[PDB]
Design an enzyme around this catalytic site. Structure first.
Site, PDB file in Angstrom:
ATOM      1  N   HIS A  68       0.846  -1.149  -0.009  1.00 35.25           N
ATOM      2  CA  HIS A  68       0.045  -0.068  -0.046  1.00 35.25           C
ATOM      3  C   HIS A  68       0.842   1.144  -0.086  1.00 35.25           C
ATOM      4  CE1 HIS A  68       0.191  -0.022   4.613  1.00 35.25           C
ATOM      5  NE2 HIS A  68       0.195   1.159   4.420  1.00 35.25           N
ATOM      6  N   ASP A  92      -0.099  -7.650   1.689  1.00 41.94           N
ATOM      7  CA  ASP A  92       0.391  -6.213   1.816  1.00 41.94           C
ATOM      8  C   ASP A  92       1.940  -6.219   1.683  1.00 41.94           C
ATOM      9  OD1 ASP A  92       0.383  -3.310   1.478  1.00 41.94           O
ATOM     10  OD2 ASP A  92      -0.312  -3.101   3.618  1.00 41.94           O
ATOM     11  N   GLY A 148       3.075   6.678   8.251  1.00 44.67           N
ATOM     12  CA  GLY A 148       4.306   7.031   7.509  1.00 44.67           C
ATOM     13  C   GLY A 148       5.415   5.870   7.855  1.00 44.67           C
ATOM     14  N   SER A 150       5.127   2.433   8.295  1.00 47.03           N
ATOM     15  CA  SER A 150       4.739   1.138   7.467  1.00 47.03           C
ATOM     16  C   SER A 150       5.915   0.864   6.770  1.00 47.03           C
ATOM     17  CB  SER A 150       3.569   1.149   6.395  1.00 47.03           C
ATOM     18  OG  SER A 150       3.717   1.990   5.204  1.00 47.03           O
TER      19      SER A 150
HETATM   20  C1  LIG Z   1      -7.113   2.585  10.564  1.00 40.24           C
HETATM   21  C2  LIG Z   1      -5.647   2.213   9.974  1.00 40.24           C
HETATM   22  C3  LIG Z   1      -4.671   2.463  11.114  1.00 40.24           C
HETATM   23  C4  LIG Z   1      -5.354   3.282   8.833  1.00 40.24           C
HETATM   24  C5  LIG Z   1      -5.501   0.729   9.368  1.00 40.24           C
HETATM   25  N1  LIG Z   1      -5.399  -0.181  10.325  1.00 40.24           N
HETATM   26  C6  LIG Z   1      -6.054  -1.346   9.973  1.00 40.24           C
HETATM   27  O1  LIG Z   1      -6.225  -1.551   8.994  1.00 40.24           O
HETATM   28  O2  LIG Z   1      -6.113  -2.304  10.958  1.00 40.24           O
HETATM   29  C7  LIG Z   1      -6.716  -3.653  10.692  1.00 40.24           C
HETATM   30  C8  LIG Z   1      -6.829  -4.670  11.731  1.00 40.24           C
HETATM   31  C9  LIG Z   1      -5.662  -5.015  12.282  1.00 40.24           C
HETATM   32  C10 LIG Z   1      -4.735  -4.991  11.042  1.00 40.24           C
HETATM   33  C11 LIG Z   1      -5.638  -4.549   9.704  1.00 40.24           C
HETATM   34  O3  LIG Z   1      -6.067  -5.593   9.282  1.00 40.24           O
HETATM   35  C12 LIG Z   1      -6.324  -5.061   7.827  1.00 40.24           C
HETATM   36  C13 LIG Z   1      -5.164  -5.067   6.923  1.00 40.24           C
HETATM   37  C14 LIG Z   1      -4.693  -3.935   6.317  1.00 40.24           C
HETATM   38  C15 LIG Z   1      -3.533  -3.815   5.713  1.00 40.24           C
HETATM   39  F1  LIG Z   1      -2.549  -2.937   6.288  1.00 40.24           F
HETATM   40  F2  LIG Z   1      -2.877  -5.166   5.514  1.00 40.24           F
HETATM   41  C16 LIG Z   1      -3.601  -3.204   4.170  1.00 40.24           C
HETATM   42  N2  LIG Z   1      -3.484  -4.047   2.979  1.00 40.24           N
HETATM   43  C17 LIG Z   1      -3.633  -3.362   1.569  1.00 40.24           C
HETATM   44  C18 LIG Z   1      -3.213  -4.301   0.520  1.00 40.24           C
HETATM   45  C19 LIG Z   1      -3.450  -3.747  -0.755  1.00 40.24           C
HETATM   46  C20 LIG Z   1      -3.660  -2.448  -0.838  1.00 40.24           C
HETATM   47  C21 LIG Z   1      -4.095  -1.485   0.222  1.00 40.24           C
HETATM   48  C22 LIG Z   1      -4.124  -2.032   1.601  1.00 40.24           C
HETATM   49  N3  LIG Z   1      -3.919  -0.975   2.869  1.00 40.24           N
HETATM   50  C23 LIG Z   1      -3.968  -1.676   4.090  1.00 40.24           C
HETATM   51  O4  LIG Z   1      -4.433  -1.080   5.111  1.00 40.24           O
HETATM   52  C24 LIG Z   1      -4.302   0.206   5.092  1.00 40.24           C
HETATM   53  C25 LIG Z   1      -3.032   0.894   5.153  1.00 40.24           C
HETATM   54  C26 LIG Z   1      -2.564   0.595   6.496  1.00 40.24           C
HETATM   55  C27 LIG Z   1      -1.755   1.807   7.045  1.00 40.24           C
HETATM   56  O5  LIG Z   1      -2.101   2.864   7.480  1.00 40.24           O
HETATM   57  N4  LIG Z   1      -0.378   1.077   7.871  1.00 40.24           N
HETATM   58  C28 LIG Z   1       0.446   2.060   8.440  1.00 40.24           C
HETATM   59  C29 LIG Z   1       1.146   3.470   7.788  1.00 40.24           C
HETATM   60  O6  LIG Z   1       1.879   4.055   8.146  1.00 40.24           O
HETATM   61  N5  LIG Z   1       0.899   3.517   6.449  1.00 40.24           N
HETATM   62  S1  LIG Z   1       1.839   4.880   5.777  1.00 40.24           S
HETATM   63  O7  LIG Z   1       3.122   4.749   5.753  1.00 40.24           O
HETATM   64  O8  LIG Z   1       1.479   6.104   6.359  1.00 40.24           O
HETATM   65  C30 LIG Z   1       1.181   4.866   3.921  1.00 40.24           C
HETATM   66  C31 LIG Z   1      -0.287   5.028   3.651  1.00 40.24           C
HETATM   67  C32 LIG Z   1       2.050   5.743   2.896  1.00 40.24           C
HETATM   68  C33 LIG Z   1       1.881   4.117   2.912  1.00 40.24           C
HETATM   69  C34 LIG Z   1       1.454   1.333   9.432  1.00 40.24           C
HETATM   70  C35 LIG Z   1      -0.024   2.149   9.992  1.00 40.24           C
HETATM   71  C36 LIG Z   1       0.406   3.391  10.787  1.00 40.24           C
HETATM   72  F3  LIG Z   1      -0.488   4.673  10.342  1.00 40.24           F
HETATM   73  F4  LIG Z   1       0.083   2.951  12.050  1.00 40.24           F
HETATM   74  N6  LIG Z   1      -3.871   0.838   7.171  1.00 40.24           N
HETATM   75  C37 LIG Z   1      -4.844   0.996   6.149  1.00 40.24           C
HETATM   76  C38 LIG Z   1      -3.986   0.845   8.864  1.00 40.24           C
HETATM   77  O9  LIG Z   1      -3.160   0.570   9.343  1.00 40.24           O
END
Ligand SMILES: CC(C)(C)[C@@H]1NC(=O)O[C@@H]2CCC[C@H]2OC/C=C/C(F)(F)c2nc3ccccc3nc2O[C@@H]2C[C@@H](C(=O)N[C@]3(C(=O)NS(=O)(=O)C4(C)CC4)C[C@H]3C(F)F)N(C2)C1=O
Ligand SMILES: [Cl-]
Ligand SMILES: [Zn+2]
Length: 193
Positions: A68, A92, A148, A150
């Site tokens: 993602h 992911d 940010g 991930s």
């Molecule tokens: C509510 C919430 C916290 C936003 C959300 N929680 C959440 O979903 O919890 C459930 C319950 C426990 C685990 C999870 O099961 C579902 C699995 C989700 C996934 F992760 F596998 C995922 N697979 C994808 C595959 C293909 C396309 C898009 C995908 N999108 C996904 O998830 C999305 C994105 C992910 C995210 O924000 N990651 C972080 C981050 O920093 N990103 S980032 O660098 O800023 C940025 C956006 C630049 C890249 C580390 C967390 C930080 F913010 F803490 N999400 C939503 C979340 O964490």
């Protein structure tokens, strides 16, 4: 557009430090051309596309990050753009061959339940392991504290890597636990036929 290295998170055991290597203009240029002449080093890189920024963690000769964040994009490198070695939308998870000059963290084999996430701002966040892919935070955090990060490393007390940060267990804007890709699942990915 390619993913570009724009910094690294320097690990010094208990503490970490975020070192920027590319400003906004340089970052955009590296992503546009897919070519990066800087000699990389370290185990945790700061990564950016044209629109997002996140982290990557070097493990077993592969720099891993989240789909993602990177999509299927190539990684900017010294010889030009490098195609992804692994791409798993279900997990992911994506990976490129680790950039030249970087080094890989050692997968954890000590089984410690006391973990810590290293964020993009070089914050160390303690967590207690809860099963294969989860760890509860010792202190709840606003989600902006973890956004940010991930693709960043989840570590054990000995400096081994336990997993790659994927998502936060978060309700009403407050994160209570971490979801991460465990290192054993990376080995499975590297063994999948
Ligand atoms: C509510 C919430 C916290 C936003 C959300 N929680 C959440 O979903 O919890 C459930 C319950 C426990 C685990 C999870 O099961 C579902 C699995 C989700 C996934 F992760 F596998 C995922 N697979 C994808 C595959 C293909 C396309 C898009 C995908 N999108 C996904 O998830 C999305 C994105 C992910 C995210 O924000 N990651 C972080 C981050 O920093 N990103 S980032 O660098 O800023 C940025 C956006 C630049 C890249 C580390 C967390 C930080 F913010 F803490 N999400 C939503 C979340 O964490
Ligand atoms: Cl997984
Ligand atoms: Zn360990």
């Amino acid at each position: 557009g390619s993913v570009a290295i724009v910094g690294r998170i320097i690990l010094s055991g208990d503490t970490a430090y975020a070192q920027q290597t590319r400003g906004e203009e340089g970052a955009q240029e590296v992503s546009q051309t897919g070519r990066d002449k800087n000699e990389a080093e370290g185990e945790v890189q700061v990564l950016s596309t044209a629109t997002q920024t996140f982290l990557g963690t070097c493990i077993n000769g592969v720099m891993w990050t989240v789909f993602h964040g990177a999509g299927a994009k190539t990684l900017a490198g010294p010889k030009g753009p490098v195609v992804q070695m692994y791409t798993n939308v279900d997990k992911d998870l994506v990976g490129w061959p680790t950039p030249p000059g970087t080094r890989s963290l050692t997968p954890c084999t000590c089984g410690s339940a006391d973990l810590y996430l290293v964020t993009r701002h070089a914050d160390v966040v303690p967590a207690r392991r809860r099963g294969d892919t989860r760890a509860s935070l010792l202190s709840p955090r606003p989600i902006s504290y973890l956004k940010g990060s991930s693709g960043g490393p989840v570590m054990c007390p000995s400096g081994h890597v336990v997993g790659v940060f994927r998502a936060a267990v978060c309700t009403r804007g407050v994160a209570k636990a971490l979801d991460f890709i465990p290192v054993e699942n990376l080995e499975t990915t590297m063994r999948s036929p």
